[PDB]
Write an enzyme that holds these catalytic residues in place. Structure first.
Site, PDB file in Angstrom:
ATOM      1  N   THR A   1       0.856  -1.215   0.000  1.00 14.30           N
ATOM      2  CA  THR A   1       0.000   0.000   0.000  1.00 14.30           C
ATOM      3  C   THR A   1       0.883   1.253   0.000  1.00 14.30           C
ATOM      4  O   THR A   1       1.900   1.326   0.688  1.00 14.30           O
ATOM      5  CB  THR A   1      -0.957  -0.081   1.201  1.00 14.30           C
ATOM      6  OG1 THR A   1      -1.978  -1.074   0.990  1.00 14.30           O
ATOM      7  CG2 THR A   1      -1.637   1.240   1.498  1.00 14.30           C
TER       8      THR A   1
ATOM      9  N   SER B   1       2.359  -2.557  -3.921  1.00 13.35           N
ATOM     10  CA  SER B   1       1.500  -1.468  -4.361  1.00 13.35           C
ATOM     11  C   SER B   1       1.283  -1.555  -5.858  1.00 13.35           C
ATOM     12  O   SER B   1       2.159  -2.014  -6.558  1.00 13.35           O
ATOM     13  CB  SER B   1       2.092  -0.105  -4.050  1.00 13.35           C
ATOM     14  OG  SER B   1       2.423   0.009  -2.686  1.00 13.35           O
TER      15      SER B   1
ATOM     16  N   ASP C   1       7.554  -0.617  -5.477  1.00 16.15           N
ATOM     17  CA  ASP C   1       7.198  -1.457  -4.341  1.00 16.15           C
ATOM     18  C   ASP C   1       6.282  -2.599  -4.785  1.00 16.15           C
ATOM     19  O   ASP C   1       5.183  -2.392  -5.305  1.00 16.15           O
ATOM     20  CB  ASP C   1       6.471  -0.655  -3.249  1.00 16.15           C
ATOM     21  CG  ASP C   1       5.678  -1.508  -2.231  1.00 16.15           C
ATOM     22  OD1 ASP C   1       6.217  -2.521  -1.714  1.00 16.15           O
ATOM     23  OD2 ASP C   1       4.502  -1.148  -1.921  1.00 16.15           O
TER      24      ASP C   1
ATOM     25  N   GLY D   1      -2.301  -1.008   6.800  1.00 16.55           N
ATOM     26  CA  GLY D   1      -2.415  -1.900   7.961  1.00 16.55           C
ATOM     27  C   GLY D   1      -3.298  -3.127   7.666  1.00 16.55           C
ATOM     28  O   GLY D   1      -3.560  -3.468   6.524  1.00 16.55           O
TER      29      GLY D   1
ATOM     30  N   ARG E   1      -4.190  -1.728  -4.999  1.00 13.48           N
ATOM     31  CA  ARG E   1      -3.973  -3.158  -4.992  1.00 13.48           C
ATOM     32  C   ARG E   1      -4.174  -3.690  -3.583  1.00 13.48           C
ATOM     33  O   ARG E   1      -3.633  -3.130  -2.647  1.00 13.48           O
ATOM     34  CB  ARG E   1      -2.522  -3.395  -5.453  1.00 13.48           C
ATOM     35  CG  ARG E   1      -2.000  -4.811  -5.243  1.00 13.48           C
ATOM     36  CD  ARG E   1      -0.593  -5.080  -5.775  1.00 13.48           C
ATOM     37  NE  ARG E   1      -0.540  -5.020  -7.222  1.00 13.48           N
ATOM     38  CZ  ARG E   1       0.595  -5.153  -7.894  1.00 13.48           C
ATOM     39  NH1 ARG E   1       1.703  -5.454  -7.241  1.00 13.48           N
ATOM     40  NH2 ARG E   1       0.628  -4.977  -9.196  1.00 13.48           N
TER      41      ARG E   1
END
Lengths: 244, 204, 227, 234, 228, 271, 206, 219
Positions: free
Chosen positions: H1, H169, H166, H47, H19
């Site tokens: 994220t 993400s 990343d 989270g 995503r």
């Protein structure tokens, strides 16, 4: 039976609530509050009958927090118990939401404390009217506006342009109604507002006032805090009235 | 793993005014097979089917609690619950056990009777939902199922074509999994009717 | 006249009769007087003895509640003793939690609050004592009275009990700005010897205490030689 | 939680709430028990015959366990609560001791529940008197009575409810030791018809034998009533 | 105190519930009219004196974005029901992610009234409510009384001037009124019973339309009063 | 405060409980309610109050769950109430919760006499413990179970219950009970039962023609079982017929009201 | 899994068998404990586990079933309702403070019509349960180390139309194969039939 | 994220990618990560999804009650205090990281809340597994008194660094603009990952699958 506990009489009324309102006048003192353009003021009788009493320990005015003041009218120790419960409420609100409680919200919370005793048996109603004073912010422009809110023993909560409470409240309200017809109180300066409040007290008591007979509180646009007004500032409002 | 102890898998797919939902039939204890006739679908009302995978004792306990709440809803509200409100209810019941969870993973499919809009949802075991417009899958052969659907599904299928795609996805994935199989059962739901079919598969 | 059976009921006129009746118990009790000098505070009270065979110190009406503060009880002594315990607990709380000696004005307001709560509930009765509070913490010398209604006020000089009307007259001929704590003991004792009624109460003695600079702001009984 | 004192002594040693409960019992329908050699009979008056009542009548003799039954007089709704407590105690006893409960021990539990209701703050007494009967695991029959104060005693024959004192005088004369199952049924029907009007469908009846219980049917009961109505003419 | 204050009397009456209902029927007048595409509720707010600030007096409340209420009787008692109702609406959204139907909210309120007629140590509420709202089954107007009884209405009134208002509505009500003709009818019905001059400052109005509940401001209400 | 306690759970001097008797008097002032046991079901009928023109419908999505006077408890149990209406709603919720917990625990329906006994124990409790007034309600309960078939029970304010072939509660219950005692018979059909109910309500209301707007009728009967999904439940077994509680509408009553007016005009002719 | 239990249903009966062994580590204390317990006139449960949990679990089920009987005019409860109550007690215990009851059961019953209004399908039923609260109706089932051998035999030889004599023979072959192949000694079996006439001991099986 | 916020001249811009993953698999390619709090206040969450969802729903409901009671617009500092007190009580077990933004009578407000219950009020922030990559664009591109258009281009460029660098993400950028008078949600503001090779269609002829049995039901 309806005379002794909170149940309805046959006409739909609650007698312990009516009698708790006579406790407000029985105490024998008079209070007047008024809101003008940039401030709110409250004038209450300072009675020190006994010559041996220490006058600065007898007060009807108290801070709930920095920015909200109260005036108690009626049975004095009943009123001090509501000052402590209001203080506790304002401090719980600040913990939970992280900001100081607005004066309209606090008045409603104390009004709910009162309503609970009109509906549950076994605890005496408190025989007081509590008047709350403070500045409140508009969401539109962010400007601050003074407020007066009164809470009575039935749990009613209401806002006023000006109010008199206590002995001879009927005669002092009549008087303020007349004066209102000239100019609305929200156009007036502090001095003009003060001359109307002091004239109403005097007219209803049928006496003359010195600075030591009244205690005065104030919040303003200039200084949000609720503060006692110094005796010298009051003398000059009484002087100004005695002329005219 | 506690989620793979009992076996089983579930898939749902969306079409044009219809959905299809499919489960396998196996019930086990790790590699031992107890029964070959245990489908994992529950009809909630004419518009909604729930598929439950995970530990079998928690599938039986959790579905009984859901049926009890649904019965009281109908008496209070005098109407059938709709798919979006049903999934919100299920998510709230799972999160109530946040720190001692039900070991189940629900799949929910519904169709709004009036509009013809289809709604799919899949949840994790503490209630977090995901609401795509194509398909949802869960259970022991989830990774394979997820890839079969991405390859075969396409927009705007009618009931019969959509049925073929869902059956092939379920049978190919189960053939690569030791813990799910022995054929499948499917429900095909439109505004007008509900059909049910038993699909033949391998016996190992 | 059913309105006077419990403290949880107003009368038609706005009164609470059980609290008035409790006040009548204080007005029939023995006399007390107190005075606030520039140094400190002095308290004195009349003890009516019920037997000539009592030890000295029996049924004391004056009690320390912290190093720098004390209380004197008028009216019913066992009721007063319950208030003394509460006051002791508030003074300790102030030292333990806020690291200060409790200011006199705060101690008086907590005692008032405690007494008031027994005027509100059908299952309790009001206390039948008035308390004189005498303190010298960081707010200077202070003298307060709390009554059975829970009302609290500050005084320069005060009298309670059945001799109070006359005693008040004599406290009005003192000069409060000028007087010291050694003069005060002589004047206050004189007032109490003069209002004593010799017909009704035959045996009595006086009890006297102070807190001042001379004593190092410690509240204590005066040594029995200064009477 | 309401915790007012309801049952208190008054000036000559009376407990009025307990005597009033005993008055509700005497207003109630009449009930009778009779101990024979190897049987116990319970017989009870019913409210009345109507065209509209349902043929399958609600039972007013209750089973507490396989081997113990209970009849009563007084407030029917209070009696149902007492029956419920005694059913749980019978099963609690099996869980703790394995054996089946003895009749005298179950009677003590019930009497203790009644006694407590006369001394607990916040509650009134049960307005109920009970007759309890059964067999131990050695075939011996017991028959007990309890009152609203919690007093219990054992009897060979007994009656409670309205006209108890009349039915009890009749039974004092005629009762004989060691009677047969049929001689007992006769004796019980006869005793009841001192209070009650007719004997059609205003009697229910239970016969309890070592390891068998029977709610008597209408046909077998009609036979026994006519036989008794014939002997009352003599 | 933990004993009951409401009890039966020899002819089977519960008199504290009647006395509470008498207190509700002496409050100031409120009313409501259901149109075919919304609902309007209205109430008098006269103050005792011009020293009172009119603006802050509330007789009409928002309970959630789709439903609102008005009352007659004892105001402080109404605040307790309004807080309980607000809370129930939010609790329903947390569980089902949709608006609480008005039928379910009224039943929740009704059961809170019923508890104060039976529990220990309490007297009944001394106010009646009108509840108005929109949900999947349409637009609704209900009345709830101190007994806890509730009724669904097409139009009705509560409070002092309530019998004359109900006779006046019976004549002028039709099943085919638009929302704007209902606002007209409601304000005309109040004017009949009103002692003095009806102004936009001493009356208050709320409306359900297009699935939303909204209080009129003073300015909006002035436009409607200049047409009647 | 103890001197103002009215002592609701205290016996009085002939073993009487006065609050329980007074609540029974309240019932006898309420709208009349009738129940009839037939070979095809149970009928429940009630008089509604006078019908104002400004009344509205709640417009509920399913119409056979609740009317003004009739409520469903479970698929095999319905009821009708007389007395304090908000008290009835509190006990109705308790019954709904009890009957559906049983089904959660045993996965089968609660017996009719068992549900009736739980309901009556909830009433008995308030007459013995806790210092408040009792409930002021009486129920007629209609049920079907595999143990005893069709049943009709009545419950009263003391917590007693009884079983009936026909019964009446509310206002004119001695008049209604006399007419039923004449015209009830063991071989009635469901439709003959509905006609016998409309004629009894006809008489007690005291109108020559039956208003279809002043009556309410419900039935508990057995209907053909629905789906039988042996693919989703391979060991599920339903029977041929299942109980259903139904609230009759104005388009189902129209022919049955006709038959009740003809039998009224042929009973005024012989006289 | 030190004790094996077996059951299977055919057209008018259910047979149920269980091993007699009680052990303390490696010592046989006795080999004649009866673990096929009768719950009512037409129902039995066979349980595998340590004596403490086994006995405390079956006495709890028996007590609640007796209570339910007398608040219902003494009518025999259906087998599916008893199964549902047991499953709910096992699953309840799993999430309780005291922990799961470590027992594995087979419940068998023969349902009989209550009255003339009763439209229940009469017949034999058999339910497999485990200590976690899993519950499944089955035609045959087993617990213990021997289970896998017997299940495979029954997959090969069981039919629904076995006669009573063919079934007793088939149960004896199942017990013999447990003795042949399992290291832990299960030397004596006790067997019971459930039929329309009630519960009876089958003496020719051991 | 990846989640991001900046303060500009008259408001706040929040951003997120879309995503969701379980393990190494992409469960949902278009999850919404920008949640409603109040008419003038929004939240993005990283989270544990269930924890983030639960906390924001609870505070959103308690703010709505408080607006009906008081009659006044919700303040962003109140939301912030209520989130922080809940998270602190559970000692990090409720694992939600949040970016909160909104506008009230004291102007724009942006802050973060960590799972243990600590807060930070700042003029640009980032959180999530892509937070380090996104923060590299913020430190190179941020300035005082940005216009609305500069601020949208800066937030979108920070989210694209997470999307491309990343692995947790991906897919696209969602934005949310919050001004004094309005809140505007812009789903799919930038879509830089379309299809390259069109999906081959795999037709199964109807009747392909063997069926043993069938039941039908009309509704």
């Amino acid at each position: 039976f309806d005379k002794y506990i909170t149940v309805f009489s046959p006409e739909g009324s609650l007698y312990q609530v009516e009698y708790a309102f006579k406790a407000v006048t029985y105490a024998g003192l008079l209070t007047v509050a008024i809101r003008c353009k940039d401030a709110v003021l409250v004038f209450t009788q300072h009675n020190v009958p006994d010559r041996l009493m220490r006058p600065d320990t007898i007060t009807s005015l108290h801070n709930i927090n920095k920015d909200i003041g109260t005036c108690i009218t009626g049975r004095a120790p009943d009123g001090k118990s509501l000052v402590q419960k209001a203080r506790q409420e304002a401090s719980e609100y600040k913990y939970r939401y992280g900001s100081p409680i607005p004066v309209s919200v606090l008045a409603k919370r104390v009004a709910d404390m009162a309503q609970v005793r009109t509906q549950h048996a076994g605890l005496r109603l408190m025989g007081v009217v509590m008047t709350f004073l403070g500045m409140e912010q508009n969401d539109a422009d962010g400007s601050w506006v003074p407020q007066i809110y009164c809470v009575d023993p039935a749990g009613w909560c209401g806002s006023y342009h000006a109010c008199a409470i206590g002995k001879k409240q009927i005669e002092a309200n009549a008087f303020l109604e007349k004066k209102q017809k000239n100019a609305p109180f929200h156009t007036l300066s502090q001095k003009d507002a003060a001359m109307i409040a002091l004239a109403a007290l005097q007219s209803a008591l049928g006496a003359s006032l010195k600075a030591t007979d009244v205690e005065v509180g104030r919040c303003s646009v200039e200084d949000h805090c609720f503060r006692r007004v110094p005796d010298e500032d009051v003398e000059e409002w009484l002087t100004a009235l005695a002329e005219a | 793993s506690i989620l793979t102890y009992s076996g089983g898998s579930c898939l749902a797919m969306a079409g044009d005014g219809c959905f299809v939902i499919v489960s396998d039939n196996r019930l086990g204890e790790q590699l031992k097979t107890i029964s070959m006739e245990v489908p994992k679908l529950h009809v909630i009302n004419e518009s909604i089917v729930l598929g439950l995978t995970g530990l079998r004792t928690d599938q039986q306990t959790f579905s009984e609690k859901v049926r009890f709440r649904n019965e009281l809803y109908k008496l209070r509200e005098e109407r059938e619950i709709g798919g979006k409100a049903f999934a919100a209810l299920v998510s709230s019941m799972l999160y109530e056990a946040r720190f001692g969870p039900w070991f189940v993973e629900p799949v929910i499919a519904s169709i709004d009777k009036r509009t013809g809009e289809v709604y799919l949802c899949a949840m994790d075991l503490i209630g977090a939902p995901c609401e795509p417009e194509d398909y949802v899958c869960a259970g022991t052969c989830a990774e394979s199922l997820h890839g079969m659907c991405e390859a075969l599904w396409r927009p705007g299928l009618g009931p019969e074509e959509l049925f073929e795609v869902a059956a092939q996805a379920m049978l190919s994935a189960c053939d690569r999994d030791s813990l799910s199989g022995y054929g499948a059962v499917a429900a095909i739901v439109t505004r007008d009717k509900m059909t049910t079919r038993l699909i033949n598969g391998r016996k190992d | 006249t059913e309105h006077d059976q419990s403290t949880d009921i107003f009368s038609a006129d706005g009164r609470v009769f059980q609290v008035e009746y409790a006040c009548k118990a204080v007005d029939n009790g023995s006399t007390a007087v107190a005075a606030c000098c520039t140094d400190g505070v002095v308290v004195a009270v009349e003890k009516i003895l019920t037997s000539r065979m009592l030890e000295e110190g029996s049924n004391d009406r004056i009690h320390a509640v912290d190093r720098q503060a004390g209380v004197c009880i008028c009216g019913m002594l066992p009721d007063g003793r319950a208030v003394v315990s509460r006051a002791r607990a508030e003074a300790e709380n102030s030292r333990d939690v806020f690291a200060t000696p409790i200011p006199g004005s705060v101690l008086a307001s907590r005692i008032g609050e405690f007494m008031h709560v027994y005027t509100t509930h059908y299952a309790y009765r009001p206390f039948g004592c008035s308390v004189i509070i005498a303190s010298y913490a960081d707010d200077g010398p202070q003298l307060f009275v709390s009554d059975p209604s829970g009302t609290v006020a500050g005084y320069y000089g005060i009298a309670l009990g059945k001799g109070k009307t006359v005693a008040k007259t004599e406290l009005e001929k003192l000069n409060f700005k000028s007087i010291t704590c050694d003069e005060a003991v002589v004047k206050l004792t004189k007032i109490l010897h003069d209002v004593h009624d010799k017909s009704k109460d035959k045996l009595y003695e006086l009890e006297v205490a102070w807190v001042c600079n001379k004593s190092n702001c410690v509240f204590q009984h005066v040594p029995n030689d200064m009477i | 939680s309401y915790d007012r004192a309801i049952t208190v002594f008054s000036p000559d040693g009376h407990l009025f709430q307990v005597e009033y409960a005993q008055e509700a019992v005497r207003k109630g329908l009449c009930a009778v028990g009779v101990r024979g050699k190897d049987s116990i009979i319970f017989a009870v008056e019913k409210k009345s015959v109507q065209k509209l009542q349902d043929s399958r009548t609600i039972r007013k003799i209750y089973k507490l366990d396989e081997h113990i039954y209970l009849a009563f007089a007084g407030l029917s709704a209070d009696a149902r609560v007492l029956v419920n407590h005694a059913q749980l105690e019978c099963q609690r006893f099996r869980l703790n001791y394995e054996d089946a409960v003895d009749v005298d021990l179950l009677v003590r539990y019930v009497a203790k529940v009644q006694q407590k209701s006369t001394q607990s703050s916040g509650s009134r007494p049960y307005g109920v008197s009970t007759i309890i009967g059964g067999f131990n695991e050695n075939g011996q029959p017991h028959l007990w009575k309890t009152d609203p104060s919690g007093m219990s005693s054992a009897w060979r024959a007994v009656a409670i409810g309205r006209n108890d004192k009349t039915v009890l005088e009749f039974m004092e004369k005629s009762y004989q030791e060691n009677m047969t199952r049929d001689q007992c049924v006769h004796f019980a029907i006869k005793a009841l018809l001192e209070a009650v009007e007719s004997g059609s469908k205003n009697i229910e009846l239970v016969v309890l034998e070592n390891k068998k219980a029977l709610y008597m049917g209408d046909d077998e009961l009609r036979k026994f009533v006519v036989e008794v109505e014939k002997e009352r003419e003599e | 105190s933990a004993y009951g204050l409401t009890t039966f009397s020899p002819s089977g009456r519960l008199v504290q519930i009647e006395y509470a209902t008498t207190a509700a029927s002496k409050g100031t007048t409120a009313l409501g009219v259901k149109a075919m595409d919304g609902v309007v509720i209205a109430a008098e707010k006269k103050t005792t004196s011009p020293l009172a600030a009119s603006l802050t007096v509330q007789k009409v409340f928002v309970l959630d974005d789709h439903v609102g209420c008005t009352y007659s009787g004892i105001g402080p008692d109404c605040r307790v029901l309004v807080d309980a109702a607000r809370k129930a609406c939010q609790k329903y959204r947390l569980t089902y992610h949709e608006p609480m139907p008005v039928s379910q909210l009224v039943r929740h309120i009704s059961s809170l009234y019923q508890e104060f007629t039976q529990s220990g140590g309490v007297r009944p509420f001394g106010c009646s409510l009108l509840v108005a709202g929109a949900d999947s089954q349409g637009n609704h107007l209900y009345q709830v009384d101190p007994s806890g009884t509730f009724w669904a209405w097409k139009a009705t009134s509560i409070g002092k001037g309530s019998t004359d208002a109900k006779t006046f509505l019976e004549k002028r009500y039709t099943n085919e009124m638009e929302i704007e003709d209902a606002v007209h009818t409601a304000l005309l019905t109040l004017k009949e019973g009103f002692d003095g001059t009806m102004t936009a400052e001493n009356t208050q109005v709320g409306r359900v339309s297009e699935g939303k509940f909204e209080l009129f401001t003073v300015d909006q209400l002035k436009d409607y009063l200049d047409q009647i | 405060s103890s001197r103002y306690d009215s002592r609701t759970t205290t016996f009085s001097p002939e073993g009487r409980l006065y609050q329980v008797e007074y609540a029974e008097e309240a019932i006898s002032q309420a709208g009349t309610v009738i129940g009839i046991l037939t070979t095809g079901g149970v009928v429940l009928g009630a008089e509604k109050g006078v019908q104002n023109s400004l009344f509205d419908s709640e417009n509920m999505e399913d119409k056979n769950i609740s009317g003004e006077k009739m409520y469903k408890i479970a698929s095999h149990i319905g009821c009708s109430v007389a007395g304090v209406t908000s008290d009835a709603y509190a006990l109705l919720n308790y019954a709904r919760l009890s009957a559906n917990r049983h089904h959660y625990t045993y996965q089968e329906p609660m017996a009719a006499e068992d549900l009736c006994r739980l309901l009556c124990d909830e009433k008995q409790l308030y007459t013995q413990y806790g210092g408040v007034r009792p409930f002021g309600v009486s129920f007629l309960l209609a049920g079907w179970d595999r143990h005893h078939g069709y049943q009709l029970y009545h419950t009263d304010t003391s917590g007693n219950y009884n079983a009936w072939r026909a019964y009446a509660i509310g206002q004119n219950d001695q008049v209604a009970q006399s007419l039923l005692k004449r015209d009830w018979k063991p071989e009635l059909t469901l439709d003959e039962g509905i006609v016998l109910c409309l004629r009894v309500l006809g008489k007690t209301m005291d109108t020559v023609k039956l208003s279809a707007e002043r009556l309410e009728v419900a039935v508990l009967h057995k209907v053909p079982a629905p789906a039988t999904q042996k693919l989703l439940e391979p060991y599920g077994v339903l029977p041929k017929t299942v109980p259903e509680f139904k609230i009759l509408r104005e388009t189902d009553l129209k022919p049955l009201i006709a038959e009740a007016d003809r039998q009224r005009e042929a009973e005024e002719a012989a006289e | 899994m030190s004790e094996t239990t077996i059951a299977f249903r055919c057209n008018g009966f259910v047979l149920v068998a269980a091993a007699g062994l009680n052990a303390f580590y490696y010592i046989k204390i006795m080999d004649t404990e009866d673990k096929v317990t009768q719950l009512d006139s037409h129902k039995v449960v066979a349980c595998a586990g340590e004596n403490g949990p086994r006995v405390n679990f079956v006495e709890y089920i028996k007590c609640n079933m007796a209570l339910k009987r007398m608040r219902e005019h003494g009518r025999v409860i259906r087998t599916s309702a008893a199964a549902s109550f047991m499953r709910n007690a096992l699953a309840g215990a799993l999430r309780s403070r005291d922990g799961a009851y470590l027992v594995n059961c087979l419940l068998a019953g023969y349902d009989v019509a209550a009255s003339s209004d009763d439209d229940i399908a009469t017949g034999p039923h058999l339910y497999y349960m485990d200590y976690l609260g899993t519950m499944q109706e089955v035609p045959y089932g087993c617990h213990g180390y021997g289970a896998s051998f017997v299940i495979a035999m029954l997959d090969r030889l069981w039919r629904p139309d076995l006669t009573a004599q063919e079934a007793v023979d088939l149960m004896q072959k199942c017990c013999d194969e447990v003795k042949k192949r399992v290291v832990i000694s299960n030397d004596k079996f006790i067997c019971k039939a459930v039929t329309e006439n009630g519960v009876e001991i089958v003496n020719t099986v051991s | 994220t990846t989640i991001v916020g900046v303060v500009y001249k008259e408001g706040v811009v929040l951003g997120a990618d879309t995503r969701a993953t379980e393990g190494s698999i992409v469960a949902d390619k278009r999850c919404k990560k920008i949640h409603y709090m109040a008419p003038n206040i929004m939240c993005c969450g990283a989270g544990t999804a269930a924890d983030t969802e639960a906390v924001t729903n609870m505070v959103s409901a308690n703010l709505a009650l408080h607006r009906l009671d008081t009659g006044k617009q919700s303040r962003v500092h109140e939301a912030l205090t209520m989130l922080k007190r809940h998270l602190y009580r559970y000692q990090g077990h409720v694992s939600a990281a949040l970016v909160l933004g909104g506008v009230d009578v004291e102007g724009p407000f942006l802050a973060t809340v960590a799972p243990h219950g600590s807060t930070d009020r700042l003029p640009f922030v980032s959180m999530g597994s892509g937070s380090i990559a996104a923060m590299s664009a913020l430190e190179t591109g941020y300035k005082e008194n940005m216009t609305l258009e500069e601020a949208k281009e800066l937030v979108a460029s920070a989210i694209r660094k997470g999307i491309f660098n990343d692995p947790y993400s991906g897919t696209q950028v969602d934005l949310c603009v919050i001004t004094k008078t309005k809140t505007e949600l812009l789903i799919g503001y930038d879509k830089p990952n379309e299809r390259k090779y069109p999906k081959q269609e795999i037709r199964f002829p109807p009747g392909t699958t063997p069926v043993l049995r069938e039941e039908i039901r009309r509704l």
